[PDB]
Amino acid sequence: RNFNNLTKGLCTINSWHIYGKDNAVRIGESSDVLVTREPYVSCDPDECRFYALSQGTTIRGKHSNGTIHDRSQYRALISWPLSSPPTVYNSRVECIGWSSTSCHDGKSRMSICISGPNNNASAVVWYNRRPVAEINTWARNILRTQESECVCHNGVCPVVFTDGSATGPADTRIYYFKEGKILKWESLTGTAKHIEECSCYGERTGITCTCRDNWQGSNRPVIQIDPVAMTHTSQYICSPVLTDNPRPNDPNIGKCNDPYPGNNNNGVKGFSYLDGANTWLGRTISTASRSGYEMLKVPNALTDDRSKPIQGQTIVLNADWSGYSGSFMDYWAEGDCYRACFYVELIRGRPKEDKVWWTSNSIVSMCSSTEFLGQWNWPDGAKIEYFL
Amino acid sequence: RNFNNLTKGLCTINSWHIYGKDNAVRIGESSDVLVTREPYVSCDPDECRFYALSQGTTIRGKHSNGTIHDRSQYRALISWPLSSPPTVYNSRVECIGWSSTSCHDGKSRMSICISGPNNNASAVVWYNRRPVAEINTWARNILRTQESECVCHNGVCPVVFTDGSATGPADTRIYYFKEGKILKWESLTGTAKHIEECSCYGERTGITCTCRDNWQGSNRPVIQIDPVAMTHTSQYICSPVLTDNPRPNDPNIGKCNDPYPGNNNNGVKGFSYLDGANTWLGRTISTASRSGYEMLKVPNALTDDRSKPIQGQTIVLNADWSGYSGSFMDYWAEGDCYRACFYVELIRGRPKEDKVWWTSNSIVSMCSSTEFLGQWNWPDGAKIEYFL
Amino acid sequence: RNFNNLTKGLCTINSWHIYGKDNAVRIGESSDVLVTREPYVSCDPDECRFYALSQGTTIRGKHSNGTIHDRSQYRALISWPLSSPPTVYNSRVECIGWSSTSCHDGKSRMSICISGPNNNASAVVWYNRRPVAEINTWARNILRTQESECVCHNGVCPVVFTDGSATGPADTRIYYFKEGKILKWESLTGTAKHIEECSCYGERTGITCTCRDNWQGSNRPVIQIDPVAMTHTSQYICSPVLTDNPRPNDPNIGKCNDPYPGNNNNGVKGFSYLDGANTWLGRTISTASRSGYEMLKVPNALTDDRSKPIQGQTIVLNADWSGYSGSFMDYWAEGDCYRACFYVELIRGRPKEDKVWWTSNSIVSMCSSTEFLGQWNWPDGAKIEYFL
Amino acid sequence: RNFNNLTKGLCTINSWHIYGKDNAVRIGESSDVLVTREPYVSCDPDECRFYALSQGTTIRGKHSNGTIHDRSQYRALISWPLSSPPTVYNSRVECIGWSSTSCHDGKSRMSICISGPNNNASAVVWYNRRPVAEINTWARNILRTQESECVCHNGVCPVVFTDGSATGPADTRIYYFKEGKILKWESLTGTAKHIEECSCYGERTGITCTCRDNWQGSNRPVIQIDPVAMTHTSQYICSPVLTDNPRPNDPNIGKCNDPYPGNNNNGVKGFSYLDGANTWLGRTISTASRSGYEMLKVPNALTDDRSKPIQGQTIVLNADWSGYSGSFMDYWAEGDCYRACFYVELIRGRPKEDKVWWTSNSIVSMCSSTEFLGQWNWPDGAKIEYFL
Ligand SMILES: *[C@@H]1O[C@H](CO)[C@@H](O[C@@H]2O[C@H](CO)[C@@H](O[C@@H]3O[C@H](CO[C@H]4O[C@H](CO[C@H]5O[C@H](CO)[C@@H](O)[C@H](O)[C@@H]5O)[C@@H](O)[C@H](O[C@H]5O[C@H](CO)[C@@H](O)[C@H](O)[C@@H]5O)[C@@H]4O)[C@@H](O)[C@H](O[C@H]4O[C@H](CO)[C@@H](O)[C@H](O)[C@@H]4O[C@H]4O[C@H](CO)[C@@H](O)[C@H](O)[C@@H]4O[C@H]4O[C@H](CO)[C@@H](O)[C@H](O)[C@@H]4O)[C@@H]3O)[C@H](O)[C@H]2NC(C)=O)[C@H](O)[C@H]1NC(C)=O
Ligand SMILES: *[C@@H]1O[C@H](CO)[C@@H](O[C@@H]2O[C@H](CO)[C@@H](O[C@@H]3O[C@H](CO[C@H]4O[C@H](CO[C@H]5O[C@H](CO)[C@@H](O)[C@H](O)[C@@H]5O)[C@@H](O)[C@H](O[C@H]5O[C@H](CO)[C@@H](O)[C@H](O)[C@@H]5O)[C@@H]4O)[C@@H](O)[C@H](O[C@H]4O[C@H](CO)[C@@H](O)[C@H](O)[C@@H]4O[C@H]4O[C@H](CO)[C@@H](O)[C@H](O)[C@@H]4O[C@H]4O[C@H](CO)[C@@H](O)[C@H](O)[C@@H]4O)[C@@H]3O)[C@H](O)[C@H]2NC(C)=O)[C@H](O)[C@H]1NC(C)=O
Ligand SMILES: *[C@@H]1O[C@H](CO)[C@@H](O[C@@H]2O[C@H](CO)[C@@H](O[C@@H]3O[C@H](CO[C@H]4O[C@H](CO[C@H]5O[C@H](CO)[C@@H](O)[C@H](O)[C@@H]5O)[C@@H](O)[C@H](O[C@H]5O[C@H](CO)[C@@H](O)[C@H](O)[C@@H]5O)[C@@H]4O)[C@@H](O)[C@H](O[C@H]4O[C@H](CO)[C@@H](O)[C@H](O)[C@@H]4O[C@H]4O[C@H](CO)[C@@H](O)[C@H](O)[C@@H]4O[C@H]4O[C@H](CO)[C@@H](O)[C@H](O)[C@@H]4O)[C@@H]3O)[C@H](O)[C@H]2NC(C)=O)[C@H](O)[C@H]1NC(C)=O
Ligand SMILES: *[C@@H]1O[C@H](CO)[C@@H](O[C@@H]2O[C@H](CO)[C@@H](O[C@@H]3O[C@H](CO[C@H]4O[C@H](CO[C@H]5O[C@H](CO)[C@@H](O)[C@H](O)[C@@H]5O)[C@@H](O)[C@H](O[C@H]5O[C@H](CO)[C@@H](O)[C@H](O)[C@@H]5O)[C@@H]4O)[C@@H](O)[C@H](O[C@H]4O[C@H](CO)[C@@H](O)[C@H](O)[C@@H]4O[C@H]4O[C@H](CO)[C@@H](O)[C@H](O)[C@@H]4O[C@H]4O[C@H](CO)[C@@H](O)[C@H](O)[C@@H]4O)[C@@H]3O)[C@H](O)[C@H]2NC(C)=O)[C@H](O)[C@H]1NC(C)=O
Ligand SMILES: *[C@@H]1O[C@H](CO)[C@@H](O)[C@H](O)[C@H]1NC(C)=O
Numbered sequence A, B, C, D: 001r002n003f004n005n006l007t008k009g010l011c012t013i014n015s016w017h018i019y020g021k022d023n024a025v026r027i028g029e030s031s032d033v034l035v036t037r038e039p040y041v042s043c044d045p046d047e048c049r050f051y052a053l054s055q056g057t058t059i060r061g062k063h064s065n066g067t068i069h070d071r072s073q074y075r076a077l078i079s080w081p082l083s084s085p086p087t088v089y090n091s092r093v094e095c096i097g098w099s100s101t102s103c104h105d106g107k108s109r110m111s112i113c114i115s116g117p118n119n120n121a122s123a124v125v126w127y128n129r130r131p132v133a134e135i136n137t138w139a140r141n142i143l144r145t146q147e148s149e150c151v152c153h154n155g156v157c158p159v160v161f162t163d164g165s166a167t168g169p170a171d172t173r174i175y176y177f178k179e180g181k182i183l184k185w186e187s188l189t190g191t192a193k194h195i196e197e198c199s200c201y202g203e204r205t206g207i208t209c210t211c212r213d214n215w216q217g218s219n220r221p222v223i224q225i226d227p228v229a230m231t232h233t234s235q236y237i238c239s240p241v242l243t244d245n246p247r248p249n250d251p252n253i254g255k256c257n258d259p260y261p262g263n264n265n266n267g268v269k270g271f272s273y274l275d276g277a278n279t280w281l282g283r284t285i286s287t288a289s290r291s292g293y294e295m296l297k298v299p300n301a302l303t304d305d306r307s308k309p310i311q312g313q314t315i316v317l318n319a320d321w322s323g324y325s326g327s328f329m330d331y332w333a334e335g336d337c338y339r340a341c342f343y344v345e346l347i348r349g350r351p352k353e354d355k356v357w358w359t360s361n362s363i364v365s366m367c368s369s370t371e372f373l374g375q376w377n378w379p380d381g382a383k384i385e386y387f388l
């Protein structure tokens, strides 16, 4: 087969339809379902699969105790069939680590996992299910990457890494891989002041990443990558529709080239589709915590610092817990346009539900429709009392 | 490969032989078997599989409590190997929703799932395991479809939808899909007064659907579809051998173009094979509840309002619980005729068995034989006391 | 590919080596392992698999209670990978019934399952995983077949059926199938007086079956089938080395054309390889019950009514429970000869171990070696006390 | 496809990166994970898999009691996907026995399992998942082999066997197989005085095996095999960096042609990569017991009896239990050199942790990097108290 080429634009987004949902915590109440977090979705040319970081234990297992913690030797990037739960028996390990990304270039899949202590972490780059390249920490402070899928064009797969402080200036790099080999890396340029957990998608040979400013910003940084020239720029989403969490209330003027102030040293992985009048932003409904999720249609959100929503769709009720969210698309689907998709991590357990001693999640996933479809709300659906 | 063409007639039906049985509730007593309902069977060119709507929980799981309810965000159309039970580890999710149909056109499979609140539901049409088209509710009252397999001819797959009241005039539409794309839809025509949960099969390029009148009728509506012209007609089975449930006792004159009165606002999904002198009708044995199941040979049942049985076969004893039933055939089998097949849903739990708090089912399935085979009876076989 | 042709002779048998063992009862103590009995082994051109009749429940499941009973609606022929246990999640259902046979003809597999009440049973013949032909009971008294693999030559697969009394003259038929279709059947001829549960193998275009006389004989009946002419003969193993169970002690003169007397109305499925000086007989060690298993080299056992052993190999200690045993070979292996193989069913539970309320088994399997290998003994290995 | 040819040299080893980890004991606390020991890793041309000897029971199963014992009829060589745990439902049995080796020659896999009583054991050689050759015990004292992967060149796969005393002179043989057939065997020659559990790898058509002297030596014997000439030599690692366990403290002069004294009648399976200045040795950190694991870069360790480490990497902390370790490589990976890999068995349970009555293990695996990567430590990670 051939390397995928990013030759299409986004389909017109008029609403979102249900794509996938695994009900993992519900099923895991009485099945051998692995404890996970930081999930995402990624497509092969012939299959789409759920991905996540396992904690090396099942939910009902006693080793689920303490799984609020993010980094350990027992974590691994796993994948499993669309909308099935991540079970011990159906999960495929991609690589070992506690921070990851993965994407198919059209011929084979590249997966990257970072492991190690906070001051000595390293990334291993897998291609065609074999280790090919390794990257040592350059700032010795939790080398970390996207936690959702990367995107490839003509064999070149850009990946965003950060190494350094989570609460101040850090060392962000953009690596360009081909068949797992490092073609090039570059230090972050542009006006984005802090970069974490980028969510990316590709269309008419450009790759757009929406990231998390964990330092001073509650507006989201954007990295725009040219995979042919292997260069990039960065800024913030200009819109006063703020989409980090926690965050201040929406003002009437946003910030294009600096963090919007109000909330320090926190954030959540999120995403957006920036496409002129076809622009949709995702965010938690609550400004205080990771609960609820909504999509908002905000024309020219990227460049217009006065832009407001003209349409929306609730995905998860404010009464229900959400979590990380990110973008993916089926680049191998039929048609003349790419259908925008996304997932929302539905975190259950600690810290918000501390009657149990574990932290896990389930997945809900949506794709865009050209129809104006009716909306439902999609909770995790598990009852904590059952786990007591 | 090629689109299947409906070029054969039905094989002569002289009896029925066992085809499949999954014993799901028996096995689920101590295995991770998903709670389901509304099952069916559908064939690929190289495999036949069981299908059903999962409830997003196992039987022994505590989330099985309350699964009598038909619609929730935790349901999904799943498929699994013939005669195996629907387990967490062997079930493949086709799409997310609480009403479905699915069929293979010879090249790829189309699956349709409806999800949403009762007043804002939508259908998503999957083809080759990718979402392709979406249909919003047109009557804002539980958009719903067949709950058994559709049938394709030369790539065109007709599907019957209903939106609107379950106890009065509703808005029924027949959609015609090809590779998941909508070619055409039409409002229901003919003399059928209410349409639910159609069971369909195809033979010498015609498709026949036997449905459920949930309004005033205890005779079954029939929709006859021309997949080439993409048109249809409708009436009722003329025979006084009534096959809905609940139902009045069999009279000596049936009704061809209007509901046979006696039982309002109820019914059950059922099926028939209408083939002149080779006509067989399925029905519950009880006239009051979903218990027992029998096949009855009723010559020209479709057109003769005096027709009575001349042969029969008991499938499930009246002492045992049945449920939904529907038609399917292996359109890719060897031979010069299509072998008529059907399944019977064996519902266990609520409402009839309320010592448990769940509702699930197992599956039994039969195919026709040209031999006059001896009959057995095929119960679910689980003992409720074991679940207490 | 092509139909297999029986062009090779048996390899010289100088000892037996371990081939497969699933430890099903051991593992089933704390895993979802299906209750089975009547197991066997059969090879595809690219894989060899274990086969058995499931009871539609796991061992730890409460529905395991009462599984001593042979016939029910919840039984099915299942297959699963060599030496793995028969689990809910890895078992493939071949067909539904309580008596079976199965074999690959080189192109596709034929499987036959019999189901029904004792007075109205029927066989369904599956080919390429589709139902093709059906056979109704002809004597209305538990239609039953081999319970081990059949053998094919040039597409023709002979199968031995019995219908009628288990304790007197019955109606035995030999059917000849091709691609699941009935070419021919014939009533049993020759001097065998009663036929049950034939174990068969093929070599230089002839098929040899060793069966069970359940009426008056403790010597085993033999059916020799010509799959080209589609004819057969029958007699008994002439050797005074008696191999049924229960049985009298070995005399010095056997019987070629009549039952050897001593034990009425009982027996066990067994096998032999009849090959002149390369002849090996299998039997339980105990003359009273299904315990122990040994192979004995008995030159010209088939034709010499004075023949005694000159070599042997213990497979299962007399202290351990055995059960049914049968023949199979990998007809698609490399080399100029067929390697003789066999399995022994290791029955655990009732009636011999009635502290538990279930009956199940595990499998041990051996193949011949041209070496004179050391012998071990191969028990089931489960401790009943663990199940209490 | 073609036979693999050993045409490449080793990649430069500057550090080790995480390759695989299954967390089997952690997951097995509440999942159907098989009890194992003596694990290893071996690659097919299209997949790499974990291997081990099952004990025919799960960890939580009551039959786990007593699994400290090495040899029984319930053991089997199993394989399962990389970094998944060995479960009842995902494990593939290669052959039956309690001592094994396995390797892919480029076309098909050869697996060898030894079974039997201590005085009558036999090896069965499987090729392309079929039994092909058998070897009877020649010294009648626990015939045993490598317990890690063999290596093939141009279809010829050498395997090291030992039969005889574990505490004195034994009968070691090197067998040369092709497609499972015995080409040749030879008695051990050279200056190695005792040989057990060889760990092998291949590079520029030579095969190097690092073994265990269980008699008088705490330095490791090395067998160097020419797979073309089908001949071999043997000696000890000359370096005073002793790598058996238990062992004396490191002296300043090692021994090339005789055991280094201090510890009798014990040892552990281990490995090394002997490659001039690119030489790395593995060993337990403790000199007294199987705890901890480290890699040490020891230039010309094989030939220089004064050689000391100049670099190292800790794999497992001394505080954590280790066990057997061995070599493997992906001979089918891209690039101009073979990437050195190894696994470490992480033994949990008895004898060191006798609060539980079982003995099992998990696996950690590393591969070499040309980068100087930061190091982590990789414990099994299970808490014994959870199993009480
Ligand atoms: C069946 O399903 C269908 C399909 O899903 C359902 O229909 C959907 O219904 C939902 C809910 O109502 C809609 O979502 C909302 O959309 C509005 C935007 O639409 C309105 O505004 C448009 C823009 O108007 C402005 O510009 C135009 C210029 O052209 C001008 O004409 C106009 O006067 C005004 O100047 C209008 O165009 C639009 O009209 C159109 O659509 C109507 C249908 O909705 C139709 O009737 C009309 O004829 C016309 O066609 C419409 O008036 C979003 O504003 C809204 O999002 C806000 O509100 C939700 C709460 O509901 C909140 O969570 C959001 O975050 C957001 O509110 C926050 O952000 C604002 C921006 O900063 C801020 O100003 C707010 O104060 C608020 O801020 C606070 O909360 C946030 C969040 O916690 C916090 O961060 C802040 O700090 C602060 O605390 C919804 O997304 C769908 O659009 C609609 N879809 C369709 C296809 O119709 C249908 O209801 C279902 N049926 C049933 C029976 O259930
Ligand atoms: C081994 O297995 C074999 C194979 O399975 C077993 O053989 C099978 O046995 C079963 C059970 O007996 C049979 O099923 C029944 O079939 C009859 C129909 O067959 C009879 O009627 C035929 C038609 O006769 C009429 O027309 C001809 C014109 O040509 C005329 O000659 C005749 O005088 C009459 O006018 C006859 O042709 C037929 O004879 C043939 O077959 C005989 C074998 O059966 C053979 O001996 C003959 O020589 C000849 O070859 C035979 O007489 C069905 O009527 C019947 O279905 C009714 O009864 C069951 C209860 O058993 C019920 O559940 C059904 O719903 C139905 O009854 C309801 O509906 C009627 C129509 O509305 C109504 O009139 C009834 O009052 C009743 O209504 C009530 O109940 C329903 C249900 O709850 C409710 O909804 C209503 O409101 C109301 O309350 C059976 O299906 C198989 O046909 C037969 N198969 C074969 C191949 O033989 C064999 O028994 C097994 N062996 C052993 C040892 O077990
Ligand atoms: C490592 O592993 C190896 C390989 O497995 C082990 O070696 C094996 O050891 C076993 C056990 O000893 C052997 O099995 C037995 O074989 C004998 C047959 O071999 C003997 O007889 C041969 C025939 O001799 C006759 O004919 C020749 C004519 O040529 C004539 O010369 C001779 O005088 C006599 O007339 C001999 O050729 C043979 O010698 C050869 O082999 C020797 C090694 O064994 C070797 O030393 C010699 O040099 C020569 O090479 C040998 O003498 C079987 O008879 C026997 O089977 C009977 O006994 C067992 C009990 O052990 C029983 O279960 C069987 O059912 C059977 O006994 C019943 O049936 C008889 C026939 O009806 C009847 O007469 C008996 O009374 C008895 O009947 C009772 O019990 C049954 C069962 O319950 C019941 O139904 C009846 O009603 C009644 O109650 C064994 O199968 C293997 O052959 C041997 N293999 C090899 C390759 O060596 C080795 O031991 C292991 N090492 C260690 C350390 O453990
Ligand atoms: C982030 O990760 C990185 C990457 O992993 C971490 O960096 C790693 O750090 C570890 C730990 O320090 C290092 O492992 C040790 O390596 C040393 C060898 O390196 C030293 O020695 C080299 C050789 O020097 C000699 O020769 C040269 C001739 O050229 C001569 O110049 C010199 O004077 C001397 O004569 C030096 O070249 C080397 O310097 C280089 O590297 C430095 C970085 O380390 C750098 O700063 C320099 O500039 C230069 O580039 C360095 O000095 C091993 O010796 C050591 O292994 C011993 O010690 C461990 C305990 O730590 C023990 O377990 C080992 O078994 C071994 O000690 C036993 O064996 C000896 C030999 O028999 C014996 O003499 C000992 O007494 C001891 O014996 C006892 O214990 C054993 C075991 O129980 C028992 O069997 C005996 O009987 C007895 O009881 C370590 O392996 C890595 O090399 C290093 N990697 C890299 C790439 O830097 C970094 O730390 C991490 N960062 C953070 C913040 O955590
Ligand atoms: C989890 O571990 C903590 C110790 O850190 C303990 O206090 C708590 O009881 C544990 N919870 C359970 C459910 O075992």
Ligand SMILES: *[C@@H]1O[C@H](CO)[C@@H](O)[C@H](O)[C@H]1NC(C)=O
Binding pocket: B065, B066, B357
């Ligand atoms: C099921 O839920 C109901 C609450 O709606 C509760 O009363 C009942 O006890 C529950 N049953 C079980 C078995 O937990």
Ligand SMILES: *[C@@H]1O[C@H](CO)[C@@H](O)[C@H](O)[C@H]1NC(C)=O
Binding pocket: C065, C066, C357
């Ligand atoms: C099995 O069923 C019988 C009733 O036939 C009952 O007496 C016995 O206690 C049951 N055994 C178990 C273990 O439930």
Ligand SMILES: *[C@@H]1O[C@H](CO)[C@@H](O)[C@H](O)[C@H]1NC(C)=O
Binding pocket: D065, D066, D357
């Ligand atoms: C394991 O078996 C021994 C008998 O050898 C027994 O004493 C011990 O209690 C058993 N342990 C468990 C946990 O059953």
Ligand SMILES: [Ca+2]
Binding pocket: A212, A213, A214, A215, A216, A217, A218, A244, A245, A263, A264, A265, A266, A267, A268
């Ligand atoms: Ca922030």
Ligand SMILES: [Ca+2]
Binding pocket: B212, B213, B214, B215, B216, B217, B218, B244, B245, B263, B264, B265, B266, B267, B268
């Ligand atoms: Ca009705």
Ligand SMILES: [Ca+2]
Binding pocket: C212, C213, C214, C215, C216, C217, C218, C244, C245, C263, C264, C265, C266, C267, C268
């Ligand atoms: Ca008998």
Ligand SMILES: [Ca+2]
Binding pocket: D212, D213, D214, D215, D216, D217, D218, D244, D245, D263, D264, D265, D266, D267, D268
């Ligand atoms: Ca030693």
